[PDB]
Design a protein around this nucleic acid. Structure first.
Ligand SMILES: [Zn+2]
Ligand SMILES: [Zn+2]
Ligand SMILES: [Zn+2]
Length: 85
DNA sequence: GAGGTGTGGC
DNA sequence: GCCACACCTC
């Protein structure tokens, strides 16, 4: 399958796209750049940039349907939702 | 909550 | 490659 060949790392992935992303941990490549005025943050993964942009926007797409609380990530909500039952 | 990351449908 | 789920660790 898709093995990392950097300095005997050996980590293996199921898709080449996963391997490509993992290789950035060795190269320091960060292709996803925040465009927020004044911010120069960059990230190795698109979804990391999405998390960063929500720091700028305060956007909380995941509203709990049993109380007022909202969250930036679905896993945060899923954990909270357990406390309603 | 936040960061890091393995994953898979499309 | 995009995107978001899901899990671990702090
Ligand atoms: Zn590697
Ligand atoms: Zn930014
Ligand atoms: Zn709630």
């Amino acid at each position: 399958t898709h093995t990392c060949d950097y300095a005997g790392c050996g980590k293996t992935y199921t898709k080449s796209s996963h391997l490509k992303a993992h290789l950035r941990t060795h190269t320091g490549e960060k292709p996803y750049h925040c465009d927020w005025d004044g911010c120069g943050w960059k990230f190795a993964r698109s979804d990391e940039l999405t998390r960063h942009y929500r720091k700028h926007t305060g956007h909380r797409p995941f509203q709990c349907q049993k109380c007022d609380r909202a969250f930036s990530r679905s896993d945060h909500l899923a954990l909270h939702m357990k406390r309603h039952f």
